[PDB]
Curated annotation (Swiss-Prot):
Gene Ontology cellular component list: cytoplasm; cytoplasmic side of plasma membrane; cytosol; endoplasmic reticulum membrane; focal adhesion; Golgi membrane; membrane; mitochondrial outer membrane
Positions bearing N-acetylmethionine: 1
Family matches, as Gene3D superfamilies: P-loop containing nucleotide triphosphate hydrolases (3.40.50.300)
Outcome of swapping residue 61 to H: In lung carcinoma
Effect the entry attributes to changing residue 22 to E: In CFC2; exhibits an increase in intrinsic and guanine nucleotide exchange factor catalyzed nucleotide exchange in combination with an impaired GTPase-activating protein-stimulated GTP hydrolysis but functional in interaction with effectors
Species of provenance: Homo sapiens (Human)
EC number: 3.6.5.2
Designated name of the protein: GTPase KRas
Effector region (motif): residue ranges: 32-40
Entries under PROSITE patterns matching the protein: RAS
Gene Ontology terms for molecular function: G protein activity; GDP binding; GMP binding; GTP binding; GTPase activity; identical protein binding; LRR domain binding; protein-containing complex binding
Originating gene: KRAS
Length: 167
């Protein structure tokens, strides 16, 4: 059975853990421990294909040991996550995409831009700002809520479709 190694990246507080746990365990977590970095497995079906998803929810501390490089490099696709009510988190996306390109030593790595917390009023990042960042990377943009499940399957599934295209 085909396995997909997906890595969820982005600033603290954007909902990497809440999206990963909504997908895998179908509930919404308040203030998940930001020190906990885990891998989560899920049998799913995308375009009629029963696949195994191996999903790394990144956490802890920013650090660049060989060992961290090697654990991130196992990633076949990346969710670049920001929160639509957090402009600083959107302005950090470029950093995560640069570190992805470095450890994969490639200008073409399957990625999806995810604008999370779309159930919230008082958005500070507009749809157009995030569609233009994603068009600048040649990658898709999907709007999610870890809380209502809006777009959650579609963000993960769209990343899988990106990895298939790369093959
Ligand atoms: C709140 C806890 C949490 O979820 N995380 C801690 C911060 N983590 C993290 N943060 C950054 O950068 C923070 C900002 C952005 C610009 C400079 N800095 C002030 N960068 C990374 C991480 C996780 C580890 N990262 C990393 C290490 C090695 C290789 C790669 C390759 C590809 C992507 C990331 C890599 C970078 C994580 C979340
Ligand atoms: N309303 C709402 N809150 C969210 C969403 N995603 C995450 N949160 C909350 O935002 C906070 C940070 O999310 P968390 O999953 O810890 O993000 P992480 O640090 O990137 O893993 C927690 O209190 C979450 O419950 C969302 O889509 N909508
Ligand atoms: Mg977390």
């Amino acid at each position: 059975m085909t396995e997909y190694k997906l890595v969820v990246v982005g600033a603290c507080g954007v909902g990497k853990s809440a999206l990963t746990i909504q997908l895998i365990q179908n509930h919404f977590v308040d203030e998940y421990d930001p020190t906990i970095e885990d891998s989560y497995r899920k049998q799913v079906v995308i375009d009629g294909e029963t696949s195994l998803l191996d999903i790394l929810d990144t956490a802890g501390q920013e650090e660049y040991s060989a060992m961290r490089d090697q654990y991130m490099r196992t990633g076949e696709g990346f969710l670049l996550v920001f929160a639509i009510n957090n402009t600083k988190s959107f302005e950090d996306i470029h950093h995560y995409r640069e570190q992805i390109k470095r450890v994969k030593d490639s200008e073409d790595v399957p990625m999806v831009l995810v604008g999370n917390k779309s159930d919230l009023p008082s958005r500070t990042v507009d749809t157009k700002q995030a569609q233009d960042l994603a068009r600048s990377y040649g990658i898709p943009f999907i709007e999610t809520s870890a809380k209502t499940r809006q777009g959650v399957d579609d963000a993960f599934y769209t990343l899988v479709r990106e990895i298939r295209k790369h093959k």
